[PDB]
Each structure stands twice: as C-alpha cells, then as structure tokens.
Amino acid sequence: QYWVTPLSKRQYLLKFDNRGVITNAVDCSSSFFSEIQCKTKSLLPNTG
Amino acid sequence: AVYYNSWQNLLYDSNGNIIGFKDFVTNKTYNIFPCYAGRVSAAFHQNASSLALLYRNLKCSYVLNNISLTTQPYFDSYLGCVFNADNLTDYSVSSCALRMGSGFCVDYNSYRFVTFEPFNVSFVNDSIE
Amino acid sequence: SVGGLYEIKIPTNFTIVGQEEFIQTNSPKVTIDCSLFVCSNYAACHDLLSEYGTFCDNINSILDEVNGLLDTTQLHVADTLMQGVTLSSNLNTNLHFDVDNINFKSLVGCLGPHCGSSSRSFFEDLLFDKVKLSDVGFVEAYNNCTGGSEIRDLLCVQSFNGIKVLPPILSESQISGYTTAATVAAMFPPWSAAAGIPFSLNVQYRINGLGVTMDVLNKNQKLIATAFNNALLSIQNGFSAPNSALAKIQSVVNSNAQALNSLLQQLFNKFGAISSSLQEILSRLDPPEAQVQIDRLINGRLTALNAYVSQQLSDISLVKFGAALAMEKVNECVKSQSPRINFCGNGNHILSLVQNAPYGLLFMHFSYKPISFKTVLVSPGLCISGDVGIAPKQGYFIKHNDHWMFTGSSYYYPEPISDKNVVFMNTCSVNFTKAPLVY
Amino acid sequence: CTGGSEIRDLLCVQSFNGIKVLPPILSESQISGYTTAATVAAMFPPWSAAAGIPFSLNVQYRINGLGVTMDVLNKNQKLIATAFNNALLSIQNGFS
Amino acid sequence: LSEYGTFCDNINSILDEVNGLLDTTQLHVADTLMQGVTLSSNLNTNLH
Amino acid sequence: AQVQIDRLINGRLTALNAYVSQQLSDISLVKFGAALAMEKVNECVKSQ
Amino acid sequence: AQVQIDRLINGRLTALNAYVSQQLSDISLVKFGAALAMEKVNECVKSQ
Amino acid sequence: FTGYFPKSGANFRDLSLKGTTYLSTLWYQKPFLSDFNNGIFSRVKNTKLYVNKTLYSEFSTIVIGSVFINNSYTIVVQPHNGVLEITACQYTMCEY
C-alpha cells in the first residue's frame, strides 16, 4: 500500500503535548467545524 | 530537559518568542526568562524635601541586590519594599492624601507608612442583653 | 363574580426563601505604562515615541482618572455600609452570634482591631476562597514574579510589559469588616440598621405588612426563625454547585484576565511591519528603514491602547452604575425596608442582608414564600348598616361559619372585622356586597 | 436580498459588505405576549399585578390617596371609567 | 489583513460582548414583566 | 498594490474601531434605559 | 510634502477620534448625574 | 502554522502496484503517472515478509522527476530492508 495525496500551502492548528510531540491537528479551511477549532485555537470549542 | 530531539535546539512559546535553548557545543539546556521590568510608586507631599518610594511586589533584598543600592531607610511592607518612610502600621488615619492600596497610607508630618481607616463604628457602652 | 364574591387562592402555609444577588461595585485597577508597553527597553523606539508626545500622557491620564473614580466609588460604598452604624463596646462576636433563635454566626466575622485582618465572616471566607484573583490574589501573584520559579505566570509577563493591576485603596478585609459591622448592627441594641427594634420583631412586622395576621406570626416564631436560618444555609450551600452569583463574580475576573491577555497579545501583532519584535527590526535594518517599521509598531500599539482605554471607560461607567445600585440596595433593603415592590429581589420581600464579595457586595434577599393554598370566595368591600362602605386593609372579607369575617391577603386566618383591618367610607361603592347585619 | 427585486435595498448592500442586524433572542411577539399577560393580570382575579383588588377599586383608592373624598369618587364611578377609557383612546389617537 | 493579527478578533469579541449585554438585558426586562404574574385558565380573548 | 491595500486596511480598521467604541457607549445608555423601564414596570404598573 | 502631511493628518485624526470617544463616555456620566439630580428634585425637594 | 500540508477530507490514492511476471503498459500512464504540483504526502504500508521466520521489510519505490530522461535529474526513494536509499541522478529511466 502506497497512499498518496497532494500537498498545498495550508494553515493548520498544531497541538503539541507536554513532551513536544504533535498529538492533534486541524486543517482550518477544510470544514465549518475546523474553522471554529482554528478560531478558538482548541480541539473542543466551548458550547456556543 | 528531555524534549529536545537530535534535530531540535530552540524552545518557542505560542507567540513565536524564544523561551529556551540547547547549547550546540555543550548540549546543556537552559530556560530563558525576561529581565525584571517595573515602576516605582513615589509618594510626595508638598511640605516634604524628599519622597517615600514603594517598589510594588518586590522584597527589599531584591531591590538592593538587583535594582539599585541606596542610603535611605527601608522595610518590607505588605505592598512591597518601602523606602524613606517609617513603618507605623499600628497607627491609623481617617483622611489620607497618599493612598498606597490595601488600606495603607503614607502620612507626612518625615513620611510614615500608616493604615488608612476612613470609617469606624460609633461606640456606646450600653448593655447587649 | 358569584353574587358579590370572587375566587382567590390565599396561602395556608408559608416558608422563607433566600436569594443571592451579587452586585459588582469595583473592578481590578489596571495601570498601563504606555512607554514600557509600546517600546520595551529599545532606545530607537523611545526616540520615535517621543514624537507622538501626548498620546502616552493621555493613556496614563485617562487610566489615572478611571482608577481615581474606582477609588472614590469604593470609599462611597464603604461610607454607605458604615453610615449610621452604632455598636455597643460590650459586643463580642465570639460569644454573641444568635438572638431570638436566628443564627448569624456565619454572617459575622470577629469584631474589633485586636484580630487584625481576620474580620471576615464564614460566609465571606466561603465566597472568597472560590476566586483566585481577588485583591490579595493579585498581590500574591505579583509577589511571585521575582521568586525565581520556572512557572511563567501570565500576570508576570503582563507586568513586565507594563500592564499591572493595583490593589484597591481599601482592602477586601476592611470591606468585610464594614459588612460585619453593618450585619451586627441589626442583631443587637441599639439596632441601628434594623429600624431600632429587635431583628426578630423587624422580620415579624415585615411579614405582617405583606398581609399576614400577627396572631400566626407570634405563635410560629420558632418556625419563622428556623425557616430564616434554613434559607441562609440554603444560600451558603448554593455556592458549592453551579451558581449564578458565583458565576457573576468569576465573570469579573475572567473578563479582566481576557482583556489584559488581549492587550498583551497586541505586542505580537506585526501591524504590516516585517516583524512584531523590535529586536528583529533593529538587527535587520538601519535607521532609515528601521524607523519606518518601528513607526508601524508604534501606531498599532498606541491604537490598541486607545481601544483598551475606550473599553475601560465604558466598563467603569457600568461599574459606577452597579455601585450606585448596590449603595441604593444597602440603604433601601438592608438598613431599611423601602416601600418598593421588586427593588430588593423578586417576590414578597421581607428583609435583606449584605456580605462582602470579590469586587462587589453579595445581598441575601429573604422573601415570604407561600407553600400551600386554599381557594376561597372573597369580597373586595362590604356595604354595612346605614349604607356605610368598608374596604379590607391588606386583606379580604370572607364568609366564615355563615358570618362576615376578615383574612389577610397573604395568609388564610379568618378573624373578626374591626376598625383595625378596615378603611371606612361614608357611602358604599356599587357592587360592594350588601351586609346590613355587620357591626 | 436573494429575491429577483429590481429595488436595491441599502440593508442588502450592508449585509453583503459584512454589516448585518441580527434578531433579538426573544421576538417582539413574545414580549407582546408578556405585556399582554402583565395587563390582564390587573383586570381579573387574582389581580396579581393590581395589589390583589379589582382594577376599578385600585383606580378609586389611588385617586382617593391624592386628597379626593371617597364619596364623590364612588358616586362618579361611570364618569371616572369613561374618563379613563377616553384617556386611553386619546393616547391611541395621538400616534396618528 | 492576516498580518495585522488580532485586530478583527478584537472587533468581533467586543461586538459579541455588546450583543450578549443586549440579550441579557432583554431577558431581564421579560423576567420583570412576567414576575409574580398569575392568570386564570378561564381567560378568553374573545369574551373578556 | 500592497502599499495601496495597506492604506485601505488601516482606514477601514480605524473606522471599525471608532464604530465599536460608539456602539459600547450607546449600549451603556440602552442598559440605563432598560433599568429605568424595569423600575417603572415594578413601581408604576405592578404597584404604585 | 504629501507624505509628511499624511503623517500629521493621521496623527491629528487619531487624536480627534480619541477625544470624541472620551467625550462620549463623559457625556454618558453627565446624563446619569442629571437623572440623579432630577430624582433628588422630585423626591427630596418637591416631596419627601 | 502555515506549511505544505494535505487537504483534510480529501482522498488518498493507493498507487502501489504488485505484479508476478507480466507488467501492464497501462500501469505506466495516467492516472498512475501523476502530476507533482507543489508536492505530495505519502502513507506507506511496510509490507513485513518472513523467510525462515526472519523479518524482511518491503514497500514500493517512488520516483520524482519531469521527463525521466538522462537530460534531467530524477529523484528515487527506494527501500533496502531497513536502509532507505535516496538518490537524485541523470538516470536512463526504463519505459516500464
């Protein structure tokens, strides 16, 4: 298996843990929920 | 520190500031903190020939060892190091032109660091029962 | 109306309900050093900032006036709490904490200067330990900025960038001493904050004024006192769960922390310049172009300060309004009972009490709450004897045992009609029920 | 704004440029329901918004409290009620 | 505009707070209108 | 084009800042008026 | 000359916006003070 | 952070091809021969085989280039059982 996908210049929300490892990420322009996650700079935005 | 991998030598905060690094030669790791920055709260009375200085939230040892040495008398108040004022918090004043915060005042005759008590109860010696 | 009577649900039993209300009377006294915020330590920035001249003098002056308004407001609130308070020197809160079966031990701190700063009630202790950034909280947080700790407290970064919150002119311990004095002034003679009469009698007369006969009040005094201290306990236990008043108190600290953090984030905005860092600009460009980039940062940071100062002026206007309302509630709900229906909280307001809270005052409004109701037929007036009209005072006329009697509007207790509970008229109005056999 | 209208509403230009007025959390119809409930609460039992007594008696006691004897006040009840409804009609006609 | 940083976030945040104050105020006015209001279930708009 | 667009961004952001400042000031008067209206409801309609 | 005059225009206009925002806040306080004065006239002078 | 990243919600394409003896000429045309544009992100399965219980790692080799003629540099990323050989040379690439 050799899965490939195109790359492009995109803005991402990168979350780093207490040891410097990227544990989670969000593609900001991918969907409406991703836009809320990037706007609030959090993986689980507050109810609103 | 244990978070630096083989290719990493700089630690950054969420704002893009350098806050730590690993020395390329000695491999020793250090945290970088900003140098102290602050203000001096100076209390002045027109009849005085000097000032009462308050280094807010700073111990007098810190002021003398890391900011500046001086010949003025000093003491550690609740609000921070106070210079050129006598510690007289046991005394109180109902009016105060130099209000320093948390019920403290600077009173000039020298300057006195005194408690500020603008209001008090009218007392009577009548029975409670 | 059947004949001349209407159907009304009159209470047959009641309880006392306590309601909290936090009124913000103060806010953190934010000070900006405009020079240190805009330019940090960089001489090339300070030279340019001098050419903007009076912009930093305006930022400093407007915030000094705003902080002066907050200090004047705090003195006015303290003056209001202590206005007319007279206490006996024989009063010792360690032994004197309950009277007439009503317990104020939780609402009263130690009294007198021998305690020092310990003049805070159990109620205020329980309300202050849930808020980290109170006046003492800010002082302790700023004290830790030079403690050499590895923890990067956001308040320390803000203060090093010239953004520091100063303590209020009166500590929250002094204000708790003033609320304690105002509270004991209602429990013991001369009762200077309880209409000059015992607290239980003031509660009884206030409940009677709602349309409750005094006969049930002076025999249910134990039940009234137990309902009153149970309402107080319900208020105290309400802070251990999601509470609207505690959330309102925490909103003051959260909104201030959000505004200060938002102001600090302006130091990382590029404002169209090559970098948000003055060190990077000065290490990449010479004076002819570095000054252009530094001027972009100066305009952006000064614009951010003018916006923050406009927001602070608006917020302090709201705090002055809230402090005026709190002073009015002290005077017209705690020290006295003004004839205004829903001013001191909702419902049949009996009486109110006050306690100190972070950046404000917490009022406890006690109300007469009906438990059970009886549907009865009432007459709003009667035409008696020689066509003389009578109207009931804070009650209704009732046919009890096929005889006309009076009952209070807030408690069903039929009692004989007399000049004590009647308004007389020389002529009776139309539709007043005809009763020639009365009096 | 999305209709096939030839009329250029200035609000549509504002909304397309990012400036828009959002509706309040409670519709004005709900507030009208609340003012209606507050008004009928004074007319009928238990008169929860009229001191617990009939509206006409509340008007009569309020006028008496100004220094008007209850005799002329209860003998002229229809004149007072007609003056009250004429005042209400005058307020309604004043909007024209 | 992305190089200006938080300017548009500040404008949106201040307007959202202002609108939250208007919403809270409208709820307080509605609560005040409805406070203590008791009506009979027998009330009818077409008869009374 | 960046120089020209930057002048427009600065003007438009300054205009939004001015409008937001005016909106905060006007909502303070609206809150004051709403408090007066709640007081008039309680002390003129529900009671005298 | 246009470049230098533009710097002065932006500074003078920025200062005029700051003064206008301060004036709006101060007049809101004057309106609150006048409302309190009218209440004192009506409830302390003309009546008690 | 802004960088060269995949589009979330887009589709990966498994371009790996396994043969035994015969090679299809269609395997060397579109859509297998894909445009590079800015770049690509690869998620590669490490096909862990065993001979006499001894583990061996195999996966598809990728070539990146333009015309694949010795007038041009072709980058080649090829595994050698734990060793990833990466070269960029003027290779005479085969037709297949």
Ligand SMILES: CC(=O)N[C@H]1[C@H]([C@H](O)[C@H](O)COC(C)=O)O[C@@](O[C@H](CO)[C@@H](O)[C@@H]2O[C@@](O)(C(=O)O)C[C@H](O)[C@H]2NC(C)=O)(C(=O)O)C[C@@H]1O
């Ligand atoms: C891209 C693709 O579709 N790839 C599949 C491949 C092709 O379709 C086939 O190569 C095309 O052929 C053309 C172009 O002519 O088929 C595979 O499966 C075969 C059966 O389809 C496989 O079982 C083989 O079967 C044999 O009968 C035979 O020779 O094909 C005997 C041989 O020993 C045995 N190989 C072993 C033992 O690996 C394979 O592998 O080749 C699985 C691959 O995923």
Ligand SMILES: *[C@@H]1O[C@H](CO)[C@@H](O[C@@H]2O[C@H](CO)[C@@H](O)[C@H](O)[C@H]2NC(C)=O)[C@H](O)[C@H]1NC(C)=O
């Ligand atoms: C500092 O740390 C680096 C990284 O671990 C050390 O570099 C390694 O040194 C050994 C011995 O020469 C080599 O086998 C590795 O290949 C080196 N790794 C890299 C990434 O260069 C370095 O020796 C350390 N130096 C000191 C003074 O501690």
Ligand SMILES: *[C@@H]1O[C@H](CO)[C@@H](O[C@@H]2O[C@H](CO)[C@@H](O)[C@H](O)[C@H]2NC(C)=O)[C@H](O)[C@H]1NC(C)=O
């Ligand atoms: C500043 O003055 C106060 C008041 O005299 C000092 O506090 C007292 O300290 C003594 C011990 O020396 C205690 O017995 C008292 O109970 C304290 N009183 C109070 C009100 O706390 C204080 O220690 C002095 N501080 C310095 C640094 O001189």
Ligand SMILES: *[C@@H]1O[C@H](CO)[C@@H](O[C@@H]2O[C@H](CO)[C@@H](O)[C@H](O)[C@H]2NC(C)=O)[C@H](O)[C@H]1NC(C)=O
């Ligand atoms: C009436 O007076 C008595 C005597 O002063 C009061 O009785 C005390 O009440 C407290 C509770 O507040 C008890 O803990 C004490 O033990 C009681 N003492 C005695 C000697 O009985 C009583 O509370 C008063 N009641 C009212 C309603 O005025």
Ligand SMILES: *[C@@H]1O[C@H](CO)[C@@H](O)[C@H](O)[C@H]1NC(C)=O
């Ligand atoms: C200051 O000096 C003036 C003039 O002698 C005097 O009126 C005033 O009372 C003095 N105040 C104090 C605090 O010394």
Ligand SMILES: *[C@@H]1O[C@H](CO)[C@@H](O)[C@H](O)[C@H]1NC(C)=O
């Ligand atoms: C309040 O304190 C001051 C200073 O100790 C004193 O002059 C004043 O007389 C006190 N108040 C009363 C009511 O005695």
Ligand SMILES: *[C@@H]1O[C@H](CO)[C@@H](O)[C@H](O)[C@H]1NC(C)=O
């Ligand atoms: C109270 O004070 C007055 C005035 O000094 C004195 O006459 C009286 O005897 C005192 N009474 C008590 C119980 O201390």
Ligand SMILES: *[C@@H]1O[C@H](CO)[C@@H](O)[C@H](O)[C@H]1NC(C)=O
């Ligand atoms: C009133 O209500 C309480 C709680 O339900 C009850 O304990 C008490 O006995 C009741 N009293 C009467 C007179 O109904």
Ligand SMILES: *[C@@H]1O[C@H](CO)[C@@H](O)[C@H](O)[C@H]1NC(C)=O
């Ligand atoms: C201040 O520092 C001390 C010692 O590290 C710590 O115990 C305390 O919790 C800190 N308090 C605050 C408010 O930072």
